[PDB]
Amino acid sequence: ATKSVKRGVAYDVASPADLSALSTGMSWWYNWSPKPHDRLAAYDYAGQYNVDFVPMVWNANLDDGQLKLYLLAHPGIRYLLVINEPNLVDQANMTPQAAAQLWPRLEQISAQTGVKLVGPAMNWGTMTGYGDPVAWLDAFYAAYASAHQGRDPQIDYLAFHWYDYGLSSMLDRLSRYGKPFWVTEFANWHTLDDGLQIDSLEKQKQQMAEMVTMLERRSDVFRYAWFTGRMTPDPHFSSLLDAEGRLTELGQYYLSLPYS
């Protein structure tokens, strides 16, 4: 089937039956880790389902040799997601200096394997002083440049996560770095009782269609990934899958939305 190169899912796909269901409309997935779920090891998903897996270095706890070996043995992998929400204490929780210290290892992987670096994956944060992703990125750039005679860190794409209204405004703010984006988690989880709360499937479908239209349209958005395959409880009706190998109404909707 012809489908959007952009359209992904943020979910540890484990079942081949879940790929059948998703592959109609989904080009790619990731699972916040350097390798796909073990269940998929002896399945040619690239060839049968026309889906690719994008590996991720979640924080500085990195087996460089093992990742390099995997990437070199899988030359069709062209992108490496790096650093999952460093400015969130409940995620990578990396200071700007800690991320700058890791970065040369990631540049060496890029130089050795050809992969482009997609990250850090930013959000509005909880790390002291670094709620604003612009503050965190500015400090990271300054830390890296300090340690490398003024050179900026290699960033092929920035990544972004967003669970509210205003995702286009956040991309506009972050366009100050002059880098294109992957939006590697999104949904609308607004909860406050202000009229905008997403408390029905109809309202999540409405926001999914609005956000997908905008992401497909933007020339500086290469890829996006919906959160998520399955979750429970699911108060904002974010799940694309139900039983093994079965789409929800939202899943069927997502995979059939138009694209660029």
Ligand X SMILES: OC[C@H]1O[C@@H](O[C@@H]2[C@@H](O)[C@H](O[C@@H]3[C@@H](O)[C@H](O)O[C@H](CO)[C@H]3O)O[C@H](CO)[C@H]2O)[C@H](O)[C@@H](O)[C@@H]1O
168 binds ligand X (CB under 6 A): no
Pick from 30, 58, 237, 253: which binds ligand X (CB under 6 A)?
58
84 binds ligand X (CB under 6 A): yes
Q: Could you tell me which stretch among 57-65, 99-107, 119-127, 211-219 binds ligand X (CB under 6 A)?
A: 57-65
253 binds ligand X (CB under 6 A): no
Pick the closer one to ligand X by CB: 58 or 181: 58
113 binds ligand X (CB under 6 A): no
* Structure token pair of residue 135: 């503050």
Q: Is 75 exposed, middle or buried (0-12, 13-18, 19+ CB in 10 A)?
A: exposed
Q: What is the DSSP string of 24-84?
A: TT--EEE-SSSS--GGGGG--HHHHH--EE--EE-SS---HHHHHHHHHH-TT--EEEE-B
33 binds ligand X (CB under 6 A): yes
Q: How far is the CB of 70 from ligand X (least distance, A)?
A: 14
Q: Is 63 exposed, middle or buried (0-12, 13-18, 19+ CB in 10 A)?
A: exposed
83, 90, 78, 87: which is closest to 54 by C-alpha?
78
Pick the closer one to ligand X by CB: 33 or 168: 33
61 binds ligand X (CB under 6 A): yes
Pick the closer one to ligand X by CB: 2 or 61: 61
Residue corresponding to tokens 């100050």: 176
91 binds ligand X (CB under 6 A): yes
29 binds ligand X (CB under 6 A): no
Element spanning 241, H or E:
none
User: What is the binding site for ligand X (CB under 6 A)?
Assistant: 32-33, 58-59, 61, 84, 91
